[PDB]
Amino acid sequence: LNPYSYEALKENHWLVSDSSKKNSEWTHKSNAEQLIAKVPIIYVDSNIVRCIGGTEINAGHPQVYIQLDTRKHGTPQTCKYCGLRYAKKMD
């Protein structure tokens, strides 16, 4: 799994990936990547999921909507404001 391979670049949006997630500790001066990677994929029945980054409006990020009806079934989608990743509960 070479981070500079064409397959890896295409899968990671043409960005060099860090599997260990340790380089961010220096690059962005935080372990937030490691912390967020621990949260598992949240499975949502609906095709579209609403995220506000909290329990109430103004307590998180602006209300956003994520399409879980991916052209490939079951592909998780990550929220842009927070790293939470949601996937459709295919059955």
Binding interface with other proteins (CB under 8 A): 2, 4-6, 9-10, 12-18, 21, 23-24, 27-30, 32-33, 35-39, 48, 50, 53-54, 56, 58-67, 69-73, 77-78, 80-84
Q: Which segment (4-12, 20-28, 38-46, 79-87) binds Zn ion by CB under 5 A?
A: 79-87
Edge-first strand listing for the sheet containing 77-78: 42-44, 85-88, 77-78
Residue 49 sits in the site that holds Zn ion (CB under 5 A): no
Determine which helix (DSSP H) or strand (DSSP E) holds 44, and give its type and residue range: strand 42-44
Give the separation between CA 36 and CA 21, rounded to whole angstroms.
11
What is the nearest approach in angstroms of Zn ion to the Cβ of residue 21?
20
